[PDB]
Amino acid sequence: NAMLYPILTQSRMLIDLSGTWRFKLDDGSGFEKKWYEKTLDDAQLMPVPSSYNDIKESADLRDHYGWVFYQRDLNIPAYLKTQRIVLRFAAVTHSAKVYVNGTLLCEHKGGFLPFETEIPENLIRDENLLTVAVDNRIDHSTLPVGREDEFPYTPTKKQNKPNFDFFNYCGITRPVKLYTTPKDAYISDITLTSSLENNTARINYKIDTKGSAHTAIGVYTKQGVCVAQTENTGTEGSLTIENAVLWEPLKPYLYEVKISFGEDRYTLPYGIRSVAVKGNKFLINNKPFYFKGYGKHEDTFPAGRGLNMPMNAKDISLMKWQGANSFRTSHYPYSEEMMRLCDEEGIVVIDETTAVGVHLNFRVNTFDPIEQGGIRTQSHHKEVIKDLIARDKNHACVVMWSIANEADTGSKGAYEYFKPLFDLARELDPQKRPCTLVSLQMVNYKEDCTIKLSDVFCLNRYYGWYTCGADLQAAEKMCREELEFWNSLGKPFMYTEYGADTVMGLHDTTDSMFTEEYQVEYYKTNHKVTDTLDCFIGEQVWNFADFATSQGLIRVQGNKKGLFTRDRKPKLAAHYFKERWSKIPDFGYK
Amino acid sequence: AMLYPILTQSRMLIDLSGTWRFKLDDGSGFEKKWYEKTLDDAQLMPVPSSYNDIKESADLRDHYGWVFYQRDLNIPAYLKTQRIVLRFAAVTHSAKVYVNGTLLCEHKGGFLPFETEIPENLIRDENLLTVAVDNRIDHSTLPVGREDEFPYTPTKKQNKPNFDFFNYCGITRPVKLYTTPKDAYISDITLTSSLENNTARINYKIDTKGSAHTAIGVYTKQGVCVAQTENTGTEGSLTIENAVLWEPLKPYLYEVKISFGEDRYTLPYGIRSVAVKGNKFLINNKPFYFKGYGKHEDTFPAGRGLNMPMNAKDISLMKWQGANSFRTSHYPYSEEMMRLCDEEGIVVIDETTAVGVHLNFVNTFDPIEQGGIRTQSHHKEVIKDLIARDKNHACVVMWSIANEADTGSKGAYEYFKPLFDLARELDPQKRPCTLVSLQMVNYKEDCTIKLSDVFCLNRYYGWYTCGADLQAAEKMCREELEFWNSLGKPFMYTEYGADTVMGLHDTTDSMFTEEYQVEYYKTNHKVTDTLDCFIGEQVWNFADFATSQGLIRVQGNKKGLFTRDRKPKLAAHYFKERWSKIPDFGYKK
Ligand SMILES: CNc1ccc2c(n1)sc1c(N3CCN([C@@H]4O[C@H](C(=O)O)[C@@H](O)[C@H](O)[C@H]4O)CC3)nc(NC)nc12
Ligand SMILES: CNc1ccc2c(n1)sc1c(N3CCN([C@@H]4O[C@H](C(=O)O)[C@@H](O)[C@H](O)[C@H]4O)CC3)nc(NC)nc12
């Protein structure tokens, strides 16, 4: 379960296997014909990491249903066999079968979290083939959820039917790497928490290991000064950090925590900070925070969902330019490269699972018994929560877990589905951070089971777009009536989505849907209400940027609710928010 | 010698790209020796990337001088049993590389690779890797910067490019650590080929360091050995029966496996011939017609930085459009792109960094003492390094020595003759050489006529002259191109185009509209299609790209057939139709 980010250390190789791989669409016979046992014949070339759907100009490739095969050569030095050799897949979307020289090494379900496998040294030949089969199919058992049966026409080919509003980008989304550790004793996991009481900042550590050896830990400032250290330690302990500088939103500070175990060496960046919900306040380092930011997507052209590190950096620069302090990983865990950069840059993150589309009625009810047609995602939902927290537990930037986006939480049985998942997240997070689910707009919002479960109420609301469109006076009144209910509960609540589709270059001085001016007026109307509610502690727009979706009559070449275009150009509303967020402090707004 | 680093049974490959520390030089960075300690108060910058567009700061974008990149380098101690090498695929424009505060190497030239061994004794348990990067350009750099060439005093000193693309700088291409055996290893591989009936003879020269035995083997993609010679020394030749030739849009690559001592290296290799004969450009002895573009390495937000998903997209669009070729205007491109073009069957005109060798657009080629251009020495080095890097690529069919130098002025022949001689001496395959000719009133005095195997012309009939008078453009185009056609040698367009803002339209000829771009091209083809010696059309440009700011640059250069995010303008569809009806071979036979 433990999944430390692979790094080059004095004891660990790191070999990136990214590049140009061979690529072949399956036609239904690829497994039967055992394509993984030889070189792919009559194949294409496809960049890795990337989604495969938009690299070529083929609708057949973009809209493909089922499996594809990736393959590359793997000629490695024999001296590596003296170490433990691990193959790490940062993400393969959605499901994967991994083969070395025709031998199946591992399988994985879940397109947005890492997995790894040791390569048995008996399998390594002088020349090797690495084959990765990737499945794109979605249904009532996957996260995200695909629909099954939900002027009629018969489609030419079978297609996935996303139960979610983003394109089903698939492939080897994030890097594949070979890494090594010592064979006989190595570090398997590191858990760090912070204790700030009695005016003494301390780091508590727990170091999980394999084998028998001696453990040591040191904490170092940016400039390399050791501020605490001990040798021949226990598996758990605490270190006092004198003069500790706390990690703050938009003012990051990361210590370097160096761990040694036998010959193994591993360094973990770490920000010291506290998070707690108290009353109607979201407290970071005991100060009342106000979220300013966005729901995002991992979406760029042409790699789709694929890791784009230049654009990760551009995006954080744009958020700081705009005055934002935060974002949510809608609607799946993001790359570790993004998470580590957010730690370095001081961007606060709401870390969300892949659980979007858990809703069969947007008559079989979503949370009916599985044997009567109810949703089949709970078991996997548990695994995603475990794996997400295991990967991201040490990040200062992560302040809250989002268990699901827009599930059927006003329907019968939702509390029963979600209670074990909230209990699991609270059990597994060593920092005991707030947990939430992101609430769909529903007529019976007072019956939303988030009220019984969440530490913060996170609302997706479209007053002025999906209701009251082109009637913002009505939108304001409808917005106030509902948000006054939420405010009456005395707990922190926020917007995690609100927006209006906006095509750059469309304009009107008079309120008109899809124009840049209407996007601004939409936000002004909503803020007239939220700025008067003391328990409203955050605003995250939908969306940071325009992004790709499945095709249909209400998607103008994707979702156009971005403040920025897909190539990151600011609409009128992006300038509106730069001005607004320039006047709102990170702390003490309410 | 600069073989592309690969993972082999004898060679580790460790990519050091990622998030690096980054600091602008404030004028004290060398004096205060920032390279000896962790960079303080630093930003973060992705590597590989140009740094100019990552943030929102004009001071960063328009910075003049040096910046410092840095990262930690904690490497496994048992790599000290190997030879450890740091490869910089490209650092634009000049670099100083430090490990632990010791200067290990320096490099001039922003678009070709360089490397340095790390001395074992310098490696500590924890190491710092610092790269200082200089962006300054002048009369001694390639590309050339100007020096003195309602007036206003600028706020800050800035580079003055003598070229029409933005001066994107930084760690443009990946930084990697690799290893080879210490005692004996392969330094370079040179391959040439000759077709005798259906048997191909591959002549090899394998350069090595140390004492060991050399072996070469040739394998099909599927893995069948088709030739092998052992204990062969440095030079030799072998034969392949019924060889599959590499063809434009029908690539075929063999795998050439070399062993020397414990060292092992695999080189993909396509077999093909290139020859100019009469007015024909012959590939595998058939008259080729170039269909394609001048490109740039340009995407948002990495600028010039390696972008492998976009490289794959661009080739896909090229094949969608019916193109077969492009030119690496105006600098060598990434090895990753060049290796993909070998794999995909895209023909390349490989161009040096020599753009802006022109002081009168004092004479350009006056003596250095008298203020003439100071680039010839570095120009020779760029030619040497470019051919050393790319010599084995089947996709490279022609070398371009310079873009739009002052070749109609006195001294030009004297400047270029040693460079053409150098290129022909160093290329084992003896491929055609050209320079790319600037539009010029005295075109019959262009020294390309005395030097080049192919005359490659940049012409803007209907844009920079005869704008909005395409009937006059056609007449003036015909008058000049009938001269070039009378010389009997192959010639082509390497640039022709018209700035076009997507979304601007008119039914009636109007510059900057999508329709005018089409009519501009239709008018030029009316002439070129009638000219026997005209053997290729490469538009300017594949896609819109960033330039310096100015009154004629509508947020960069808009002559792309595609926008910067690779969307097709009307003229992109026009060329898809046109190239669908023109064969790669035998159009003008
Ligand atoms: C089951 N699948 C679906 C989903 C949605 C719709 C349909 N089928 S059908 C239809 C429709 N019709 C009404 C209009 N009629 C003509 O079409 C032009 C046009 O719609 O562009 C109109 O301007 C023109 O004046 C009309 O003569 C054409 C069909 N109109 C509207 N909204 C308005 N939505 C739909
Ligand atoms: C040394 N630096 C440079 C370079 C180029 C140019 C200048 N300085 S100055 C100037 C100029 N004048 C500027 C003032 N201008 C007025 O301003 C409007 C406008 O140009 O937008 C016109 O529409 C309006 O009718 C005129 O009253 C009328 C001409 N005009 C044009 N070409 C047209 N180019 C230039």
Author numbering:
A (entry chain A): 16 to 165, 174 to 385, 396 to 623
B (entry chain B): 17 to 165, 174 to 385, 397 to 624
Paper text:
To examine the structure and function of unique GUS enzymes from the oral microbiome, we recombinantly expressed and purified the following proteins from bacteria strongly associated with periodontitis: L2 and mL1 proteins from Tannerella forsythia (TfGUS L2 and TfGUS mL1) and an L1 from Treponema lecithinolyticum (TlGUS L1). Although the core glycoside hydrolase family 2 (GH2) fold is conserved among all GUS enzymes of known structure, two loops positioned adjacent to the active site influence substrate binding and catalytic activity. The presence or absence of these loops and their lengths have led to the classification of microbial GUS enzymes into several categories : loop 1 (L1), mini-L1 (mL1), loop 2 (L2), mini-loop 2 (mL2), and no loop (NL).
L1 microbial GUS enzymes have been shown to be potently inhibited by small molecules that uniquely intercept the catalytic cycle to form a distinct inhibitor-glucuronide conjugate. These inhibitors are selective for microbial GUS proteins and do not affect human GUS. We examined TlGUS L1 with the L1 GUS inhibitor UNC4917 using the 4-MUG hydrolysis assay. Using the initial linear rate, we determined the half-maximal inhibitory concentration (IC50) for UNC4917 to be 2.5 μM for TlGUS L1. PNPG is a GUS substrate and initiates the catalytic cycle of the enzyme, which UNC4917 then intercepts. (D) Active site conformation of TlGUS with the UNC4917-GlcA conjugate bound (salmon). Dashed lines represent hydrogen bonding distances between UNC4917-GlcA and residues within the active site.
